[PDB]
C-alpha cells in the first residue's frame, strides 16, 4: 500500500526556519509528483506548490512562490517543505499528497502536520474561581482558566470523583497568542459549606498543575 | 487571480438532497474534483474528473458541471454526511492546483435548541490584581452557530471581546463561550455589564452587576 509518513508537530516563533518532511513508500517516489497542501484553523485548504523529484521541477501557487520552498530527496524517498522565516498566519495543518496521473490530482493524502506559529511563551494558567453572586436549591460553581500557551489543558473536578453535570469549555485563542477556558459544575446547596469543590487543571507543556478552591 | 467559489453553508434535513455549488472561470475545459472532510481528519475523495465516484463512495453522491459551475448532489442527504466539502480544480494552465473556499454542509435530524447561558462576574482575587474577566458560557445549542454581543450600560462594547467557535457536545448539541477583559475600573465604573447571545433569530441576555 501507498504511505506518506510526515514529521511530527512543531511549535515555531515569527522569524525562525522550520523544515518538515514527508517520507513515501509502496511506490515509485520519483514517479510522481509530491503536492504541498495547507489548511489554517478554522479555514479551508489550500494548494501550495508540488515538486517532480524525477528533475526537481517546482511549481507554486501564486499565493506562496517564492515564499517557501519544496525539495526532495529521492535516496531516503522524502520530500520537504521550509522556511526561512516563518510568518504568524504560517499556523496550519499542512498535508503532502502523492499525485496522480493527471497534474495535480491528488491521489493519497498524508496524515497531516500540526504546526504552531506564535510569539505567546510557554506559560501555566491562572486559575480563578467562578461563583455567583451571594436562588437555593443548587447552585453554578466554576473554574476560568486564563492566560496560559501551549494547549492543552485538561479539567476534573475533586480528582475526578465529580462528574455529573461538568462542562468544561474548549478554550479561546485571544488576539495575545494566549488561551483561555473555563469549566462549571453544578451541585447542590445543601452541600455548599459540607462538601468542599476543587477544580483540577493540568497543563503539561508547562508541567503545572493548579488545585483552586472554589468556595 | 482564479479562484473557486462555494458558499460558505447549505443546510439540509435528513432525506432531501443537498446541491453544493462550486464556481470558476476555467471548469467549462477543466475536470472538478469532490473531497469530504470531517473534524481532525484528513480529507476524503468523492467525486473526481467532474462526475466519477471512487470505489466504496456511497451511491448517493454525485457530481456533475455545467457552464462555470460545478455540482456535488448528495440525494437523500444523512446525519453521516455532515461534512465541509471542498471542490478542487486547476488554473487554466493546468499547472497549478486550487481548492474552493469550502462548504459546511449541516444535516439538521434533530429539533432547533435555545442556548443556555450563564454569565460569571470577575472574582475577588482578579479583581485585586486590577483585573476583570467577564465569562459568558452557551451551551445546548442546535444548530450550531451563535452571535454573540456585549453591553455595558445598554451601550455597545467595542473591543475585548473573544468568543470561540461553536464546538459539538456529546449530545450533539454545541457549546461556545465569550469573553469580556476588562479593567478593575471599567468594571466598577457601570451599573452592569450584559451578555447577549443570538440563536436562530433571537437572543438571550444574561446580565452581571457590581456588588
Known amino acids: 500500500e501507498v504511505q506518506l509518513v510526515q514529521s511530527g508537530a512543531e511549535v515555531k516563533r515569527p522569524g525562525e526556519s522550520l523544515k518538515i518532511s514527508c517520507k513515501t513508500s509502496?511506490?515509485?517516489?520519483?514517479?510522481?509528483?509530491i503536492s504541498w497542501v495547507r489548511q489554517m484553523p478554522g479555514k479551508g485548504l489550500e494548494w501550495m506548490g508540488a515538486?517532480?523529484?524525477?528533475?526537481?521541477?517546482?511549481r507554486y501557487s501564486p499565493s506562496f512562490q517564492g515564499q517557501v520552498t519544496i525539495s526532495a530527496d529521492k535516496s531516503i524517498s522524502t520530500a520537504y517543505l521550509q522556511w526561512s522565516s516563518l510568518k504568524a498566519s504560517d499556523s496550519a495543518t499542512y498535508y503532502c499528497?502523492?499525485?496522480?496521473?493527471?497534474?495535480?490530482?491528488?491521489?493519497?493524502w498524508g496524515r497531516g502536520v500540526l504546526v504552531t506559529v506564535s510569539s505567546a511563551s510557554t506559560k501555566g494558567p491562572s486559575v480563578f474561581p467562578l461563583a455567583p453572586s451571594s436562588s437555593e436549591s443548587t447552585a453554578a460553581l466554576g473554574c476560568l482558566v486564563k492566560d496560559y500557551f501551549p494547549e492543552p489543558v485538561t479539567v476534573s473536578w475533586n480528582s475526578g470523583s465529580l462528574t455529573s453535570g461538568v462542562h468544561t469549555f474548549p478554550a479561546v485563542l485571544q488576539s495575545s497568542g494566549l488561551y483561555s477556558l473555563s469549566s462549571v459544575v453544578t451541585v447542590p446547596s445543601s452541600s455548599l459549606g459540607t462538601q468542599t469543590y476543587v477544580c483540577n487543571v493540568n497543563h503539561k507543556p508547562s508541567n503545572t498543575k493548579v488545585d483552586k478552591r472554589v468556595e | 487571480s482564479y479562484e473557486l467559489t462555494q458558499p460558505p453553508s447549505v443546510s439540509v434535513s435528513p432525506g432531501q438532497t443537498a446541491r453544493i455549488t462550486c464556481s470558476g472561470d476555467?471548469?467549462?475545459?477543466?475536470?472538478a474534483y469532490w473531497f469530504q472532510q470531517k473534524p481532525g481528519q484528513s480529507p476524503v475523495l468523492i467525486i473526481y474528473e467532474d462526475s466519477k465516484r471512487p470505489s466504496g463512495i456511497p451511491e448517493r453522491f454525485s457530481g456533475s458541471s455545467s457552464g462555470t459551475v460545478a455540482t456535488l448532489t448528495i440525494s437523500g442527504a444523512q446525519v453521516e454526511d455532515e461534512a465541509d466539502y471542498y471542490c478542487?480544480?486547476?488554473?487554466?494552465?493546468?499547472?497549478?492546483?486550487?481548492f474552493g473556499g469550502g462548504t459546511r454542509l449541516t444535516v439538521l435530524g434533530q429539533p432547533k435548541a435555545a442556548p443556555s447561558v450563564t454569565l460569571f462576574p470577575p472574582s475577588s482575587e482578579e479583581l485585586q490584581a486590577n483585573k476583570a474577566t467577564l465569562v459568558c458560557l452557551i451551551s445546548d445549542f442546535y444548530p450550531g452557530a451563535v452571535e454573540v454581543a456585549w453591553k455595558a450600560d445598554g451601550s455597545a462594547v467595542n473591543a475585548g471581546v473573544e468568543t470561540t467557535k461553536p464546538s459539538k457536545q456529546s449530545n450533539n448539541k454545541y457549546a461556545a463561550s465569550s469573553y469580556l477583559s476588562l479593567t478593575s475600573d471599567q468594571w466598577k465604573s457601570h451599573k452592569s455589564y450584559s451578555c447577549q447571545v443570538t440563536h436562530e433569530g433571537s437572543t438571550v441576555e444574561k446580565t452581571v452587576a457590581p456588588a
Open positions: 515538486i517532480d523529484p524525477s528533475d526537481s521541477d517546482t
Open positions: 478542487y480544480s486547476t488554473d487554466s494552465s493546468g499547472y497549478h492546483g486550487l
Open positions: 509502496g511506490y515509485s517516489f520519483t514517479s510522481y509528483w
Open positions: 476555467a471548469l467549462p475545459k477543466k475536470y
Open positions: 499528497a502523492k499525485e496522480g496521473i493527471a497534474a495535480r490530482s491528488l491521489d493519497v
